[PDB]
Structure formats: structure tokens, C-alpha cells
Scaffold this active site. Sequence first.
Site, PDB file in Angstrom:
ATOM      1  N   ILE A  10      90.049  24.860  70.492  1.00 47.63           N
ATOM      2  CA  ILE A  10      89.398  23.574  70.896  1.00 47.63           C
ATOM      3  C   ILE A  10      87.997  23.484  70.270  1.00 47.63           C
ATOM      4  O   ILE A  10      87.119  22.856  70.892  1.00 47.63           O
ATOM      5  CB  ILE A  10      89.395  23.400  72.433  1.00 47.63           C
ATOM      6  N   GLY A  11      87.814  24.053  69.070  1.00 48.23           N
ATOM      7  CA  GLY A  11      86.648  23.802  68.195  1.00 48.23           C
ATOM      8  C   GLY A  11      85.758  25.022  68.017  1.00 48.23           C
ATOM      9  O   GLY A  11      86.114  26.085  68.559  1.00 48.23           O
ATOM     10  N   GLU A  14      83.749  30.766  68.383  1.00 49.56           N
ATOM     11  CA  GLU A  14      84.869  29.786  68.353  1.00 49.56           C
ATOM     12  C   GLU A  14      85.353  29.569  69.788  1.00 49.56           C
ATOM     13  O   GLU A  14      85.308  30.532  70.579  1.00 49.56           O
ATOM     14  CB  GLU A  14      86.009  30.294  67.467  1.00 49.56           C
ATOM     15  N   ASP A 129      68.640  22.059  71.275  1.00 46.38           N
ATOM     16  CA  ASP A 129      69.751  21.609  70.392  1.00 46.38           C
ATOM     17  C   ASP A 129      70.620  20.568  71.104  1.00 46.38           C
ATOM     18  O   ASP A 129      71.847  20.597  70.922  1.00 46.38           O
ATOM     19  CB  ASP A 129      70.582  22.799  69.906  1.00 46.38           C
TER      20      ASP A 129
HETATM   21  C1  LIG Z   1      79.275  29.865  79.767  1.00 48.80           C
HETATM   22  C2  LIG Z   1      80.178  29.298  78.766  1.00 48.80           C
HETATM   23  C3  LIG Z   1      81.015  28.936  77.912  1.00 48.80           C
HETATM   24  C4  LIG Z   1      82.128  28.537  77.054  1.00 48.80           C
HETATM   25  N1  LIG Z   1      81.842  27.415  76.183  1.00 48.80           N
HETATM   26  C5  LIG Z   1      82.660  26.401  75.849  1.00 48.80           C
HETATM   27  C6  LIG Z   1      81.967  25.603  74.963  1.00 48.80           C
HETATM   28  N2  LIG Z   1      82.434  24.429  74.332  1.00 48.80           N
HETATM   29  C7  LIG Z   1      81.858  24.049  73.029  1.00 48.80           C
HETATM   30  C8  LIG Z   1      81.041  22.794  73.135  1.00 48.80           C
HETATM   31  C9  LIG Z   1      79.647  22.861  73.647  1.00 48.80           C
HETATM   32  C10 LIG Z   1      79.901  22.583  72.204  1.00 48.80           C
HETATM   33  C11 LIG Z   1      83.433  23.679  74.897  1.00 48.80           C
HETATM   34  N3  LIG Z   1      83.720  23.738  76.165  1.00 48.80           N
HETATM   35  C12 LIG Z   1      84.815  22.933  76.518  1.00 48.80           C
HETATM   36  C13 LIG Z   1      85.204  22.938  77.869  1.00 48.80           C
HETATM   37  N4  LIG Z   1      84.417  23.613  78.693  1.00 48.80           N
HETATM   38  O1  LIG Z   1      86.212  22.360  78.273  1.00 48.80           O
HETATM   39  C14 LIG Z   1      85.323  22.271  75.416  1.00 48.80           C
HETATM   40  C15 LIG Z   1      86.464  21.387  75.225  1.00 48.80           C
HETATM   41  C16 LIG Z   1      86.987  20.876  74.048  1.00 48.80           C
HETATM   42  C17 LIG Z   1      88.110  20.082  74.366  1.00 48.80           C
HETATM   43  C18 LIG Z   1      88.922  19.380  73.368  1.00 48.80           C
HETATM   44  O2  LIG Z   1      88.329  18.933  72.377  1.00 48.80           O
HETATM   45  N5  LIG Z   1      90.257  19.216  73.446  1.00 48.80           N
HETATM   46  C19 LIG Z   1      90.994  18.412  72.472  1.00 48.80           C
HETATM   47  C20 LIG Z   1      91.095  19.825  74.476  1.00 48.80           C
HETATM   48  C21 LIG Z   1      88.237  20.130  75.742  1.00 48.80           C
HETATM   49  N6  LIG Z   1      87.257  20.914  76.243  1.00 48.80           N
HETATM   50  S1  LIG Z   1      84.410  22.594  73.971  1.00 48.80           S
HETATM   51  C22 LIG Z   1      80.727  26.225  74.794  1.00 48.80           C
HETATM   52  N7  LIG Z   1      80.652  27.327  75.524  1.00 48.80           N
END
Ligand SMILES: CC#CCn1cc(N(CC2CC2)c2nc(C(N)=O)c(-c3cc(C(=O)N(C)C)c[nH]3)s2)cn1
Length: 296
Positions: A10-11, A14, A129
Site C-alpha cells: 500500500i505504497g 515500505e 514534512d
Molecule cells: C506508527 C506507524 C506506522 C505505520 N505507517 C503507515 C504509514 N502509511 C504511509 C503514509 C503516511 C504516508 C500509511 N498508513 C496507512 C494506513 N495506516 O492505513 C496507509 C494506507 C494506504 C492505503 C491505500 O492506499 N490503499 C489502496 C489500501 C490504505 N491505507 S499508507 C506510515 N507509517
Amino acid sequence: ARTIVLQESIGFGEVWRGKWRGEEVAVKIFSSREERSWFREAEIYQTVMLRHENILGFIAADNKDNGTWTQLWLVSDYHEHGSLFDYLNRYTVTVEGMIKLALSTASGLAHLHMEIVGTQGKPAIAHRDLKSKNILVKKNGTCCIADLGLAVRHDSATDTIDIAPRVGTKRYMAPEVLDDSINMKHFESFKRADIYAMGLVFWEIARRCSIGGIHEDYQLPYYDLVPSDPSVEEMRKVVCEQKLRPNIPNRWQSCEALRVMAKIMRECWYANGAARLTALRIKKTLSQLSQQEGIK
Ligand SMILES: CC#CCn1cc(N(CC2CC2)c2nc(C(N)=O)c(-c3cc(C(=O)N(C)C)c[nH]3)s2)cn1
């Protein structure tokens, strides 16, 4: 980490959608050589009294040995909508929807910025950021702030910062960061830089506020003035030398909610950080707006 199963990409590091006993979690995975970035982000998330509805919910920092190499894990709550960037690309929002996204972002930032005074308090924190790509949208249509790895924390007793600090995303860098005039010993200057970035995020949200079927296409701030993946020099020439900001559509004067949002943006965008609104003042303004006759 031992009992989480990764399901979907999910991006630094990683991000994965994982299952813990069948419950969705998000996992950010770092390599051994990224230990300093992983440790620092773990440290920020473990700050006393950090937990807040508009800060991504921390579950754990852990290690996982697959038998060949060690992975460094940060585990959080899972939000199906993902980033505010992705959400604003896919959807338009109502006036109520816009205010909920903006107010929840401001509430999260006001909490980060707020020193909770005590022998056992929470230090003031600046994000450094902030952008639509590291704000997440919850199922209830409110936001929470993530990617705290570049944050700095304030010791109010000595007016010092907990680390020795142009680290973040170039497009969202404050004017004083772009021209390197920012006093990096002055914590209040980092708070003011966050407000500039939040103003840019508010502009991204307001474009997607659809009234009578009318709205703007999704764009990043300065889409009209700089290349994709812009350099510090490209940003500095637009923001500092030509002194341009994202354009306010004439449409936004037709609606009291958009008029108030536009006024907040201009008062986030002053070249001098000392002139900008505080997160708490923005939270107060949007709270009042949310309950107004014709809006509520
Ligand atoms: C403590 C701690 C930790 C873990 N962590 C996690 C991130 N990021 C990255 C983001 C901040 C930049 C993210 N978190 C979540 C989430 N929580 O659902 C993300 C997400 C992407 C999609 C999605 O795109 N799809 C299609 C399901 C759905 N959900 S992307 C950063 N750190």
C-alpha cells in the site's frame, strides 16, 4: 510482528496492509541500514501523551527475523481510504466534508504543536514534512497525521530542540526553508513552517469542494508554476523571488465556508512565519464555522 501476515503493498521503508488475528493493520518496514530513521520515528510515536484522534494510532515498534535478514517494523491502525492525496484525487467533498477534513487536520497539528505542561507532560512537536500524502482519511471522514520521522521536539525549560536539525518535501517547504533563512535553533520557526504547509493542504481540499456540481480538478500546490518533483531552486524562484502562492478561484467567494477557508490560506502563506495563524486559532475558526447557520 511475529503474528502479523502481510497481504498487500500500500505504497524511508515500505508500507503493507497486514492482518493481526484477522484485524487489518498498517506496517511500515525498514531495512537494517535504515535503523536510525526507524528508531527516530518509533521515538516520536512513543512521546508521552501523544495519542490523539487526529494522529495515526501507534501499535508497536518491533524487529522480525525472516531467517536471512532482520526487518524493522512500525505497526499502526489501518485506514481503508489511505492518504488525503489519494482521497482528493478519487472524490469530491461537500462543504461539511471539506470542513471536517480541514478541522481534523488542524486539530491534529494543534495537538502536535501543544506543550502539555507537567513533570509528566507532552513536549511541543513540529512535523517538518506535512503534505496531503502523509495525512490519512479515516472511515468517519476525519484525518490523522502520519510519517512523524522528521519531527523535532521542544524542551520548553531551555528553549532547545531534541536533535540537531531542507529535510522534507520540496513542493511544501516554507519560504524561510527554501531560502535557508530559518533559525534552526528556534523551535517556534518549525511550528510556523508547518502552518504554511497546512495552508497548501487546505487549498488542495477546497478545490474538491463541489457546490451546484461545480469544483476544480485535483492539483498539487504550484502545479501551474513548477515541474513535477521540483528542486529547491525551482521552488525558491517561485515562492521567495516571484512571491507567488496557489491561486484562489473566484468561485470560493460565492460560499461563506470557502471564503473562510481562502482567508485561512492567505494567513498561512505570509513569507514571515511570525505573521502566520497558529494551528489552535485555525482549529477555533473552523470549529465556529462548522456550527454556523447555513453550514451545519
Ligand atoms: C506508527 C506507524 C506506522 C505505520 N505507517 C503507515 C504509514 N502509511 C504511509 C503514509 C503516511 C504516508 C500509511 N498508513 C496507512 C494506513 N495506516 O492505513 C496507509 C494506507 C494506504 C492505503 C491505500 O492506499 N490503499 C489502496 C489500501 C490504505 N491505507 S499508507 C506510515 N507509517
